[PDB]
Amino acid sequence: EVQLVESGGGLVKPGGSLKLSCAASGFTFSSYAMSWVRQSPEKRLEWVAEISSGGRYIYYSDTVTGRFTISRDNARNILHLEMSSLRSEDTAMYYCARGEVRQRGFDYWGQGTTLTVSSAKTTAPSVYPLAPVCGDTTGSSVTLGCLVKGYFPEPVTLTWNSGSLSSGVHTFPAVLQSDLYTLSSSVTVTSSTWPSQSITCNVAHPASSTKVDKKIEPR
Amino acid sequence: ENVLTQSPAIMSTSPGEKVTMTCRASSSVGSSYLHWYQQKSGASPKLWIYSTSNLASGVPARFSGSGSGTSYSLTISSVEAEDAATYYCQQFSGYPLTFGSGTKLEMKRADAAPTVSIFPPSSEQLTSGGASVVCFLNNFYPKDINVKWKIEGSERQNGVLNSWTDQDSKDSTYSMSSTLTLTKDEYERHNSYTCEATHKTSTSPIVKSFNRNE
Amino acid sequence: DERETWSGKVDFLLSVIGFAVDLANVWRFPYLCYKNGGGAFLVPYGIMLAVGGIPLFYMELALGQHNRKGAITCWGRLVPLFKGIGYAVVLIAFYVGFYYNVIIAWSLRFFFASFTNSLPWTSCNNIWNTPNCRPFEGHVEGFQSAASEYFNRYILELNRSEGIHDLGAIKWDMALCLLIVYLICYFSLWKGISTSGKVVWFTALFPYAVLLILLIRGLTLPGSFLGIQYYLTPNFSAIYKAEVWVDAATQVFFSLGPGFGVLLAYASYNKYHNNVYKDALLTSFINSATSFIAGFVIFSVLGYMAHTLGVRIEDVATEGPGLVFVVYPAAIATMPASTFWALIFFMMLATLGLDSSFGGMEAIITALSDEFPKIKRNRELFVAGLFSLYFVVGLASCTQGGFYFFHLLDRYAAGYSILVAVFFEAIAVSWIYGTNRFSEDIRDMIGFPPGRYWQVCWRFVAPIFLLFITVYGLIGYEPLTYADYVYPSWANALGWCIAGSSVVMIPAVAIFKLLSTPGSLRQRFTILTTPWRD
Ligand SMILES: CC(C)CCC[C@@H](C)[C@H]1CC[C@H]2[C@@H]3CC=C4C[C@@H](O)CC[C@]4(C)[C@H]3CC[C@]12C
Ligand SMILES: CC(C)CCC[C@@H](C)[C@H]1CC[C@H]2[C@@H]3CC=C4C[C@@H](O)CC[C@]4(C)[C@H]3CC[C@]12C
Ligand SMILES: OC[C@H]1O[C@H](O[C@H]2[C@H](O)[C@@H](O)[C@H](O)O[C@@H]2CO)[C@H](O)[C@@H](O)[C@@H]1O
Ligand SMILES: NCCc1ccc(Cl)c(Cl)c1
Ligand SMILES: [Cl-]
Ligand code: NA
Ligand code: NA
Ligand code: NA
Numbered sequence: 001e002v003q004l005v006e007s008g009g010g011l012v013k014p015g016g017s018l019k020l021s022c023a024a025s026g027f028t029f030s031s032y033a034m035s036w037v038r039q040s041p042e043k044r045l046e047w048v049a050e051i052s053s054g055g056r057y058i059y060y061s062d063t064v065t066g067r068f069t070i071s072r073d074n075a076r077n078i079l080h081l082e083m084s085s086l087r088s089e090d091t092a093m094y095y096c097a098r099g100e101v102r103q104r105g106f107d108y109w110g111q112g113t114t115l116t117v118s119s120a121k122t123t124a125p126s127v128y129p130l131a132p133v134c135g136d137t138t139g140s141s142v143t144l145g146c147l148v149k150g151y152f153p154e155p156v157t158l159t160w161n162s163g164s165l166s167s168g169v170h171t172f173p174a175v176l177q178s179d180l181y182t183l184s185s186s187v188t189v190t191s192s193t194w195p196s197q198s199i200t201c202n203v204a205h206p207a208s209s210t211k212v213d214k215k216i217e218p219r
Numbered sequence: 220e221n222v223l224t225q226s227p228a229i230m231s232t233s234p235g236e237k238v239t240m241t242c243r244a245s246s247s248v249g250s251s252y253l254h255w256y257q258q259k260s261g262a263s264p265k266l267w268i269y270s271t272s273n274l275a276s277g278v279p280a281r282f283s284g285s286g287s288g289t290s291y292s293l294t295i296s297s298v299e300a301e302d303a304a305t306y307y308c309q310q311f312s313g314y315p316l317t318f319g320s321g322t323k324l325e326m327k328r329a330d331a332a333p334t335v336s337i338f339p340p341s342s343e344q345l346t347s348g349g350a351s352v353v354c355f356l357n358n359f360y361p362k363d364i365n366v367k368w369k370i371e372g373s374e375r376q377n378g379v380l381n382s383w384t385d386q387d388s389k390d391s392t393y394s395m396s397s398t399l400t401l402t403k404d405e406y407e408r409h410n411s412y413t414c415e416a417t418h419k420t421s422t423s424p425i426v427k428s429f430n431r432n433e
Numbered sequence: 434d435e436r437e438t439w440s441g442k443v444d445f446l447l448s449v450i451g452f453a454v455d456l457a458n459v460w461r462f463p464y465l466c467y468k469n470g471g472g473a474f475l476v477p478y479g480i481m482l483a484v485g486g487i488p489l490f491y492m493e494l495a496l497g498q499h500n501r502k503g504a505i506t507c508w509g510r511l512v513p514l515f516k517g518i519g520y521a522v523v524l525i526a527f528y529v530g531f532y533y534n535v536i537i538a539w540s541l542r543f544f545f546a547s548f549t550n551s552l553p554w555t556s557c558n559n560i561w562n563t564p565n566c567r568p569f570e571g572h573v574e575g576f577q578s579a580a581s582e583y584f585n586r587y588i589l590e591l592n593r594s595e596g597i598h599d600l601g602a603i604k605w606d607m608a609l610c611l612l613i614v615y616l617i618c619y620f621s622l623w624k625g626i627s628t629s630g631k632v633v634w635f636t637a638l639f640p641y642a643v644l645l646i647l648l649i650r651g652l653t654l655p656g657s658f659l660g661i662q663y664y665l666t667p668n669f670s671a672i673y674k675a676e677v678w679v680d681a682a683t684q685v686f687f688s689l690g691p692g693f694g695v696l697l698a699y700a701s702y703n704k705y706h707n708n709v710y711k712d713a714l715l716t717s718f719i720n721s722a723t724s725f726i727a728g729f730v731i732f733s734v735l736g737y738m739a740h741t742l743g744v745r746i747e748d749v750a751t752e753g754p755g756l757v758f759v760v761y762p763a764a765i766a767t768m769p770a771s772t773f774w775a776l777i778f779f780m781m782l783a784t785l786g787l788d789s790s791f792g793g794m795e796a797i798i799t800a801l802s803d804e805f806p807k808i809k810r811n812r813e814l815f816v817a818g819l820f821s822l823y824f825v826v827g828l829a830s831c832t833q834g835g836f837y838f839f840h841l842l843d844r845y846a847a848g849y850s851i852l853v854a855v856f857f858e859a860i861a862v863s864w865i866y867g868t869n870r871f872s873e874d875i876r877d878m879i880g881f882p883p884g885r886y887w888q889v890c891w892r893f894v895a896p897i898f899l900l901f902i903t904v905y906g907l908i909g910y911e912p913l914t915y916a917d918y919v920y921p922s923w924a925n926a927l928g929w930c931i932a933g934s935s936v937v938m939i940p941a942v943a944i945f946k947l948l949s950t951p952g953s954l955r956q957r958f959t960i961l962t963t964p965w966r967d
Binding site for chain 1: 339353382
């Protein structure tokens with residue numbers, strides 16, 4: 001029924017400006033109040049702003065006050081947030097949330113759209129396949145790996161065999177070191193599976209226009 | 220602003236047990252205006268309890284809440300693994316609207332030792348002039364684990380990237396990846412590289428090594 | 434920006450309860466039940482209360498608290514074209530002062546006359562009595578009771594006046610009583626809601642003390658249950674008649690008192706985030722509840738008269754001042770410790786009037802204060818002059834034909850003049866200011882929008898059940914007459930000029946401000962259809 005979808009957002013340099021949008025459907029949009037809640041990379045929820053049903057009553061947190069402008073369109077059912085003079089502490093995942101009743105809280109949330117405020121340049125990742133030591137004792141199962149190194153900004157998409165095998169897979173969240181993210185992933189399979197069959201590492205980093213596959217070989 | 224502090228920060232529970240987490244406001248919050256939200260890993264928050272006592276649609280009866288003034292709490296009568304999440308309270312009494320610092324609820328289970336794997340630098344990275352050694356530590360409990368790196372017999376503490384997963388939704392364990400990064404030159408000045416892991420499950424550290432000889 | 438607030442929350446509630454609970458909760462409501470067939474009258478009453486009365490009661494309190502201004506400035510900022518609504522509604526409350534206050538004067542008069550071992554209205558052998566005096570009420574109109582002849586031939590001296598054209602001399606013990614009333618009203622509203630808010634702790638609460646005493650004393654009387662029978666005995670044949678629903682409608686609107694600008698002014702002193710929805714519901718209930726209770730108070734005694742006094746219920750069951758100043762004192766006189774019941778009864782009647790009067794006058798003061806800054810700093814001097822005007826004109830009420838003056842205003846000054854103003858109040862908010870924008874206002878205040886049930890009532894139900902009922906009242910119209918006396922039609926014309934002078938302010942200020950603004954015609958409408966700072 002009710003679906004909130006946040007769009008816009010991405011990398012912006014400090015002092016820069018960006019406009020966020022939220023598409024609402026499944027309810028009368030003009031009847032409810034809307035708010036923006038953001039979540040920092042430290043996973044802390046912080047309320048940004050509120051707009052009333054007719055947009056005639058606005059409230060801001062002292063953090064974003066005067067820099068941020070929350071707008072509303074009841075005709076096309078679109079919520080807007082216009083940011084300017086952006087700073088690094090504004091980096092977060094921004095959420096579109098309803099609604100009207102103060103005593104019932106926020107009953108619906110969007111998927112969220114990520115804003116990264118940084119002066120770091122977008123760079124493409126270097127993916128490496130991880131082949132175990134040779135020759136060694138091979139048990140029932142064997143563990144392979146994929147190393148995605150030196151990229152920015154987030155996210156990246158890593159799947160195995162185009163998403164075929166989802167089992168025994170561990171994809172470790174990225175860690176930022178000196179403005180570069182490094183991500184690794186491990187997958188375990190029976191030694192009868194490999195290298196009897198093909199294991200490829202699929203990596204996608206849309207920011208840099210990067211689509212790469214890596215087959216892991218014992219060589 | 221009205222600051223909501225939640226305790227504890229992290230909480231571990233066996234299924235079937237009961238948990239309580241508390242929410243304390245600096246100023247006073249009207250009972251009608253305080254709510255709770257549940258957020259599972261990688262997902263948006265969901266409204267859970269509103270006006271302190273009232274379960275949101277879809278919320279199982281094992282959940283309950285109470286409080287008034289500056290002190291509130293959320294209670295799960297019998298915990299399920301389905302209930303593992305982070306819980307944020309909120310006050311709508313006045314602007315600016317504030318959220319609690321949150322309580323992360325994780326499942327506990329029988330202790331498990333990690334399976335340690337060690338991966339030498341790929342031959343593709345070596346052409347680029349970089350060399351990085353990756354060590355995996357998978358499916359262990361509890362979360363705390365300690366990694367060590369020895370370039371020959373000697374501990375190297377510099378240039379390491381450690382990463383933890385979140386708790387697994389099925390087997391309820393944790394996993395960790397440690398990456399040691401070197402220059403190609405510095406890498407080839409040595410042979411035997413060693414990844415080592417000290418976990419609660421053993422007084423003896425699990426060791427994985429390789430040499431450039433093989 | 435800067436405005437005072439009620440010193441405490443309770444002040445507001447008692448000010449609203451006090452204003453809303455008036456003498457008509459006592460004489461008129463129980464009579465309507467008895468005439469309309471008892472508990473069967475609760476149905477149209479409850480229905481019109483639910484759809485018509487409480488929503489509009491709710492609406493004013495919301496508007497008042499939100500726009501934070503008196504009745505005139507409120508509608509000016511809301512719908513600049515309709516600003517006349519605030520003018521119409523305020524000077525209605527102005528007209529009511531010229532009559533309603535004399536009811537409190539009569540109460541104090543019977544109070545000052547109640548210090549004695551033997552109540553003067555008991556017997557027929559006094560100097561003001563005629564040969565036709567009977568001990569208690571009856572059918573034949575040429576023969577009155579000892580209480581009736583005491584009220585008419587002694588207190589009022591209405592027998593000395595041939596009509597409203599002849600007022601006769603001035604009665605100074607009445608003028609003194611009326612003066613006392615305006616002194617009480619002055620030193621209450623003199624310094625504003627600071628003193629006013631705490632004063633109503635008495636005037637609102639005290640009648641409930643007396644009610645309980647008179648309820649127990651009334652129910653322990655022989656034949657009290659016989660009265661309760663006549664009061665509540667359901668007859669559902671009366672539901673089908675048209676003017677019953679008209680009666681249920683007009684009572685609910687006068688009782689809750691929207692459309693006098695009183696609820697607006699009182700709410701204007703509320704803090705923005707106060708919950709006015711809980712207040713409107715609470716107050717509405719208390720008012721009707723008081724009416725229901727007072728019914729037993731009246732009819733338990735009305736039964737006692739029928740059973741032990743050898744009179745028939747049809748003759749002692751009355752509305753208006755006839756009930757409180759004649760019939761009810763008649764019964765009190767008979768029962769033991771008569772002097773005590775009489776004293777608290779007439780004191781109750783006074784405190785029922787006062788808190789209502791306060792609201793009417795405060796509605797005028799607050800409205801004029803917000804329009805003209807010169808009045809607010811000068812407020813004590815203004816209200817002094819205002820009541821000075823009231824007392825001087827009110828001397829006409831203290832004459833020997835004074836009742837004829839009273840009865841004239843009691844009809845035309847208010848009533849369906851109030852209905853067309855309230856009609857426009859709903860139409861202006863819903864169809865011009867808009868229901869969506871109004872609901873949004875309330876959400877900002879109390880945290881949640883009105884249920885769609887309230888929106889429908891403001892937009893559809895109330896205007897219809899006003900318009901239809903206010904029309905059926907014009908059809909059942911008959912020229913004003915009191916007893917055997919028929920008012921001249923020049924008197925009826927004066928009443929319409931009074932009733933009309935308010936209502937005509939809706940198109941007046943509308944046409945005036947319309948021609949006064951620049952541009953073509955349809956940006957006029959927009960300019961005057963735009964809210965204050967929007
Ligand atoms: C005779 C005395 C004692 C009682 C009078 C009855 C009154 C108070 C009752 C009877 C019917 C009631 C209404 C029934 C319908 C609703 C809809 C609900 O969403 C709000 C309350 C409201 C508007 C009620 C208000 C109170 C009400 C008007
Ligand atoms: C006469 C008998 C039958 C009934 C008596 C009615 C009395 C007890 C009722 C009627 C009106 C009521 C008051 C209405 C106003 C308020 C303000 C509120 O914030 C506290 C309760 C208080 C103070 C109520 C107390 C009880 C009250 C005084
Ligand atoms: O019958 C009541 C009392 O009437 C008179 O007292 C009057 C007085 O004449 C009048 O000027 C004054 O203002 O009011 C009182 C009470 O109404 C008698 O003089 C008393 O003896 C009677 O008891
Ligand atoms: N609450 C009855 C309505 C009413 C009673 C008295 C006055 Cl003075 C007014 Cl304005 C209105
Ligand atoms: Cl009533
Ligand atoms: Na908590
Ligand atoms: Na009333
Ligand atoms: Na009153």
